[PDB]
Amino acid sequence: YDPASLPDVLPLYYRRLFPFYQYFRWLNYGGVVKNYFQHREFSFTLKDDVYVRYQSFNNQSELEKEMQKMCPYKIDIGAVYSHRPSLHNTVKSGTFQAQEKELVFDIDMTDYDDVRRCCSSADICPKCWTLMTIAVRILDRALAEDFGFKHRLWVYSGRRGVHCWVCDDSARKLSQAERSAVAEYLSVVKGGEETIKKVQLPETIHPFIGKSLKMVERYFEKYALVDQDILENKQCWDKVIALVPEVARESLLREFSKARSSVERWDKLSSCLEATRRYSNIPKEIMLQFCYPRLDVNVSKGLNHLLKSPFSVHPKTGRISVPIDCKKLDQFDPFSVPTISLICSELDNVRTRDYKRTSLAPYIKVFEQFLDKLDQSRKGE
Amino acid sequence: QKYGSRTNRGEVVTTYGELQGTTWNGGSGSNTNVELFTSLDEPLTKMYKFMFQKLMDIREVVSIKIEELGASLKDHFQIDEFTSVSLPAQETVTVLGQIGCDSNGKLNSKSVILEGDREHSAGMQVPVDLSELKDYSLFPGQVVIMEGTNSTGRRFVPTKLYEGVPLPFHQPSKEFEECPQQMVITACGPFTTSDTITYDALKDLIDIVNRDRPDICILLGPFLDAKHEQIENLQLTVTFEDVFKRCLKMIIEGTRPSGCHLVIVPSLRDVHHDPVYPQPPFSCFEPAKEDKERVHFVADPCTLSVNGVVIGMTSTDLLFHMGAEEISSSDRFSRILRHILTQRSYYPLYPPNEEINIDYEALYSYTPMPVTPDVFIVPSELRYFIKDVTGCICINPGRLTKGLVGGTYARFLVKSGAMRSTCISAQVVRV
Amino acid sequence: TGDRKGDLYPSSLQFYQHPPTENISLIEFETFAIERLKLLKAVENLGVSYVKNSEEYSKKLELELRKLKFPYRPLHEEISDDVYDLRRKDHISHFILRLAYCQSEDLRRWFIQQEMDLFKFRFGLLTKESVQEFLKLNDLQYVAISEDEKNMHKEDLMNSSFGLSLTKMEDTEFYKVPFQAALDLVRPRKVFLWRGFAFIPHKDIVSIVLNDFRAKLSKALALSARSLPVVQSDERLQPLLNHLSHSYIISLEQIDGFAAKSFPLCMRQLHKSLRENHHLRHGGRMQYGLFLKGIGLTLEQALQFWRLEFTKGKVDSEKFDKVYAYSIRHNYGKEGKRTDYTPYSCMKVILSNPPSQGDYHGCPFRHSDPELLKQKLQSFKVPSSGINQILELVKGMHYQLACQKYFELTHSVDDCGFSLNHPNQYFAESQKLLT
DNA sequence: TGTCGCTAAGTTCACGCAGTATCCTGT
Ligand SMILES: Nc1nc2c(ncn2[C@H]2C[C@H](O)[C@@H](COP(=O)(O)OP(=O)(O)OP(=O)(O)O)O2)c(=O)[nH]1
Ligand code: SF4
Ligand SMILES: [Mg+2]
Numbered sequence A: 001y002d003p004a005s006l007p008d009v010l011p012l013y014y015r016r017l018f019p020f021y022q023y024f025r026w027l028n029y030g031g032v033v034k035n036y037f038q039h040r041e042f043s044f045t046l047k048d049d050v051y052v053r054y055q056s057f058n059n060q061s062e063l064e065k066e067m068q069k070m071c072p073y074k075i076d077i078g079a080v081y082s083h084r085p086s087l088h089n090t091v092k093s094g095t096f097q098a099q100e101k102e103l104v105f106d107i108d109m110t111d112y113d114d115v116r117r118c119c120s121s122a123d124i125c126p127k128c129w130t131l132m133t134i135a136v137r138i139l140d141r142a143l144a145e146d147f148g149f150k151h152r153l154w155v156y157s158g159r160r161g162v163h164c165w166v167c168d169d170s171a172r173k174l175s176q177a178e179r180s181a182v183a184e185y186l187s188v189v190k191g192g193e194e195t196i197k198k199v200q201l202p203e204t205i206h207p208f209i210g211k212s213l214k215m216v217e218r219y220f221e222k223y224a225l226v227d228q229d230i231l232e233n234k235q236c237w238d239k240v241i242a243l244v245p246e247v248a249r250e251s252l253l254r255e256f257s258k259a260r261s262s263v264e265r266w267d268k269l270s271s272c273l274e275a276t277r278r279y280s281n282i283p284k285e286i287m288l289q290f291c292y293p294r295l296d297v298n299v300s301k302g303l304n305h306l307l308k309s310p311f312s313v314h315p316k317t318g319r320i321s322v323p324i325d326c327k328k329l330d331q332f333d334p335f336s337v338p339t340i341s342l343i344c345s346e347l348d349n350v351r352t353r354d355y356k357r358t359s360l361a362p363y364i365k366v367f368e369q370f371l372d373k374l375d376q377s378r379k380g381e
Numbered sequence B: 001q002k003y004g005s006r007t008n009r010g011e012v013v014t015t016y017g018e019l020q021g022t023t024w025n026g027g028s029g030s031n032t033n034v035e036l037f038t039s040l041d042e043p044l045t046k047m048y049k050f051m052f053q054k055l056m057d058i059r060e061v062v063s064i065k066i067e068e069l070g071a072s073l074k075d076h077f078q079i080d081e082f083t084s085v086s087l088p089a090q091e092t093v094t095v096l097g098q099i100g101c102d103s104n105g106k107l108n109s110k111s112v113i114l115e116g117d118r119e120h121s122a123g124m125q126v127p128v129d130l131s132e133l134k135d136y137s138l139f140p141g142q143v144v145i146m147e148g149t150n151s152t153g154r155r156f157v158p159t160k161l162y163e164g165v166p167l168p169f170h171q172p173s174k175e176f177e178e179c180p181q182q183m184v185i186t187a188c189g190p191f192t193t194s195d196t197i198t199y200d201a202l203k204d205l206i207d208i209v210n211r212d213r214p215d216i217c218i219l220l221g222p223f224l225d226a227k228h229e230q231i232e233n234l235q236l237t238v239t240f241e242d243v244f245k246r247c248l249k250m251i252i253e254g255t256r257p258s259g260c261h262l263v264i265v266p267s268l269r270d271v272h273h274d275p276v277y278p279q280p281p282f283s284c285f286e287p288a289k290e291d292k293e294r295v296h297f298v299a300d301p302c303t304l305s306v307n308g309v310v311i312g313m314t315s316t317d318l319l320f321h322m323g324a325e326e327i328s329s330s331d332r333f334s335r336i337l338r339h340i341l342t343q344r345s346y347y348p349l350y351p352p353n354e355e356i357n358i359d360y361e362a363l364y365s366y367t368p369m370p371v372t373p374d375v376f377i378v379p380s381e382l383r384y385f386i387k388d389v390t391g392c393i394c395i396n397p398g399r400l401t402k403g404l405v406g407g408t409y410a411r412f413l414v415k416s417g418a419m420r421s422t423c424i425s426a427q428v429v430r431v
Numbered sequence C: 001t002g003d004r005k006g007d008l009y010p011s012s013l014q015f016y017q018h019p020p021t022e023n024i025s026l027i028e029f030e031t032f033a034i035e036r037l038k039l040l041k042a043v044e045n046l047g048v049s050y051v052k053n054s055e056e057y058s059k060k061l062e063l064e065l066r067k068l069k070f071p072y073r074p075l076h077e078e079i080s081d082d083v084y085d086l087r088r089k090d091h092i093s094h095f096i097l098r099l100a101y102c103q104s105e106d107l108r109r110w111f112i113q114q115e116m117d118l119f120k121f122r123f124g125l126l127t128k129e130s131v132q133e134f135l136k137l138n139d140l141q142y143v144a145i146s147e148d149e150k151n152m153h154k155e156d157l158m159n160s161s162f163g164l165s166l167t168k169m170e171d172t173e174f175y176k177v178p179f180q181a182a183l184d185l186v187r188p189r190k191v192f193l194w195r196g197f198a199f200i201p202h203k204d205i206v207s208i209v210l211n212d213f214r215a216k217l218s219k220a221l222a223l224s225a226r227s228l229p230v231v232q233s234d235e236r237l238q239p240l241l242n243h244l245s246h247s248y249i250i251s252l253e254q255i256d257g258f259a260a261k262s263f264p265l266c267m268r269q270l271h272k273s274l275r276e277n278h279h280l281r282h283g284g285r286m287q288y289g290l291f292l293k294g295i296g297l298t299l300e301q302a303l304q305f306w307r308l309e310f311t312k313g314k315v316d317s318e319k320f321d322k323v324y325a326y327s328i329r330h331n332y333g334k335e336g337k338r339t340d341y342t343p344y345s346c347m348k349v350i351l352s353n354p355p356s357q358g359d360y361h362g363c364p365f366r367h368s369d370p371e372l373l374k375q376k377l378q379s380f381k382v383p384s385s386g387i388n389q390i391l392e393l394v395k396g397m398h399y400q401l402a403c404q405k406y407f408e409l410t411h412s413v414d415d416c417g418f419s420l421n422h423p424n425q426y427f428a429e430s431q432k433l434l435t
Numbered sequence D: 001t002g003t004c005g006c007t008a009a010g011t012t013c014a015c016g017c018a019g020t021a022t023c024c025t026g027t
């Protein structure tokens, strides 16, 4: 993909591929609340990194128009305000307030850098994507069981991670404090680059942590012991040794000198820890420190946060921010995600059904199913 | 001693109307209906918080009094426009105002000032020159309309003083057409001799009531005089409330045989009651269940309806208060009574006399005369009288006790629709 | 229910929502006010001295409640007349104290704190039955999970509540609450969440109740402060309510620096005038001397300062020792009645001797014309918006709020955080922020 | 019921005017 080719393709996509009808269905939420779509904030990033916010639109036609006119490189969705953002200058000071917004989570592979060995920075590979695969299951289950949020849209971020939009009416009316509470409840791996032991579970395992460890276990052997090989050599297993009390460290080292496979080393570590009881949760702390999602509480706390819009185009990879089907999560491949260049090649190879002829169709289908569920909830209620 | 040995007992000192027999008899309050005159304004029947008068409120009350009376008089006289009192007037102009004295002394013909209302004069005053007025009768607080000129802008010269306009009499309903004539015995305090606290005159009057069986007995205060020599020098061995309670028990229980409706009016000289005018009714005595329908604790002043006959009454010595201030060009009491009736207030004097405490909001609310009463009871230290002023029978029964010697009471007969002769006969009699 | 009782006082504890409507006597008013002031002061003292969960705290608070005859224990007998009386006391006294404790933010906070403490104690003395009764009468509608559902989530509940034993857990019943109300519990993961509801045991509940109470009470106090002008006109209740809170039941050189920064505008003006003319009339002398006593200036230090300042006014030093030395000694409670006179409060300064020509005492916000105050604020480099806000507050007769805004602007703090009711309080807060 | 006049020094008190000293207010 040639990023110099981005300015050539962006218009066509925004003209014949961007799913505006479903997009308006989403952000309009069945028209129940008046001025809901009209008070939504958008922000655009144009060529040469020119940023504009407090953009609002009257209806789908105005949005389609101004978007096709501007051809933005980035589209971010923001809060629904007390008035129309376009007229925020006209609103008396203090009377312009963000009132409702989806509850959103951003999981970014870059935040896992201190604990992955295959890639670094913005590089991803099939060996590390399983971490995202874990996160979506660990988090989404909580959101479906502990909090009872029923309408959850998971979206690929385009490069390094995934976003989650929780759109239940209750989740859209949550205050800042309630959002911060939700984020802290879901958050376990606490600390920066200056801390080595980032998980310190108490004697009692809270049911949520038990279910997160149960989800982790299913994948741990493949991710950590086979793929990541977190015990390949001394430079790496020194870390895991650094994560357990010194008392057994020596006892482990000799054992790790006689083990040929990291699965064997994990068995040995588990046996040694079991023999050594307050430390019976130490293996769980290691698993969490290598597998549990990291959440930027600043992303989810603030109501006025602008997050990458679904079906955006990644300025560098060119991939489309496509929704991820929860059931088919295990089959999701971030490298097969349609790029803008591929879908423009597909478009120029054959009115409201043009996208069905591209590789974008199944993802718009997943989005349509999610919107159908939202409509059913709006009606039934 | 002197009172007990008097020889003129029962003497009729004054008479008016149809001649009656030497003995008067009543219906014992059998076919009698006594109530408070039902007018637009509610009557004073309970205590009102006082001792808090804002000068602005007094100003407003006085101004609205002048304005309202002037509006009624303007409608009656078909006057076109009122002019500001203070402004100069080279030609004749009509001015509405109230009379007053330029100094603190008693009013005289050379000390008269006219103060206008807020609406037409911004409350400004002007001296008055009575040289060109041939006939006049003025007292302070009197609302007047005058035609005059002010050539110097500093001295108003009246040329005409418009006469007063009394309120219309009451047009009784036919509900009381078949009721008989009613007998009313009215007496005013003090009820005890200057040197005694035994209420001998009251006992004699109660005996008279039981003997004659009147239909109504109107007793006006004081009942425990503040000026009584025993009261002032603190020689009483019992509380004021106890003496007053004993007096009221004597009155009510002693009148049981007569079955006579008692109307008790307080006085500003009642040492045991709230010293404020208009005075609220007495509230420290609860009549027995057998006397509740007979006793009426009314306010000062009171307008009573007795089978359609409207009786106005006040304990305040209006005639003494206004006689000290009224100035005339050339009967003085008749003039003062006509002034009271035409001003349509039971106390039109402003500033009041030194012996009366006036709450001006209550005065505004409870001193307007609803109509011109058929009978007007005005006890006074002045001599007793029965006068006919503009068709109203004004009765001054004197006071039951005059110092050490016995005083007088009055008895009159009232029937609605008689002949306007609502007062058949009236007599001032000695105790 | 003897003569004039009713169902107006169902339960002992109440949220104090409905104001009383009765006609009480002045003696009853005063007795109730003073009694509840004693109760609240006892609560504050015991809270400072002891830990609120301590048994000593409970014993002493019960003793005080018994001594002052306030409702503290339930009675499963009926609404006895005596009990009714006590409850009536509580209900009226509370609102009276509201009228007393709504004038200044400081006072408000104090009141709220004491009230909350008392409420907590009383809740701690409620039997489960009574507790539920209360939770119903106020439409709090806190239940309650079924036994079958409890067995369904037995293990989850066991692992949710800290330090809960199997059998002891079997002996306990939980409540289902929306998670938006259990923020403080969910945030550290100390209560199980299932399908948007938290399962909260019977120790923590008081917390939620208290939260609700506090919200309500704060709102009420605001409203009361908004309805103050109607009460100030009642002289009978002014001496009490305005003063209930006060009812019996350093180097010389650095002074200038404080004058630059720490001194409130009143003291700044007084110091400027003193240094301009090296002489202050009696009122200025009294005010500034009391303030310098408050900051900590000792008798010797103050004597030296006043001597040095006045000697420059072209007067004999011995004249100073002859005349002003006695005044100084008296100001420090050294002679005469020998009383440690307290420094003037801003309220006194506002209501103290009215300054005239040639005077500089008093509160500038109250005794300075709006143009003069604007000029002075501009001189101090205050932002135009800040000056306008201060002027608006002054025009609103809330001079204390104007001084608080001054403090906020000068100290670069969004909120003062304290109810300024004493110039020495201003100086102490400034010193705390700076030093 | 009438009790002569005026003039003048002198005592005791009540106040200006100025000077000296001590004692105050608050929370
Ligand atoms: N009104 C009045 N005047 C008197 C009285 N005593 C003295 N005077 C006056 C008026 C006498 O003309 C004048 C003379 O007083 P004197 O004591 O020297 O006596 P007088 O000269 O009358 O006679 P004399 O010196 O004895 O030859 O004093 C008095 O008692 N009453
Ligand atoms: S509010 Fe108090 S500290 Fe501030 S200027 Fe006025 S008197 Fe001084
Ligand atoms: Mg001096």
Ligand SMILES: [Zn+2]
Pocket (backbone or CB within 6 Å): A118, A119, A123, A124, A125, A126, A127, A128, A129
């Ligand atoms: Zn990788």
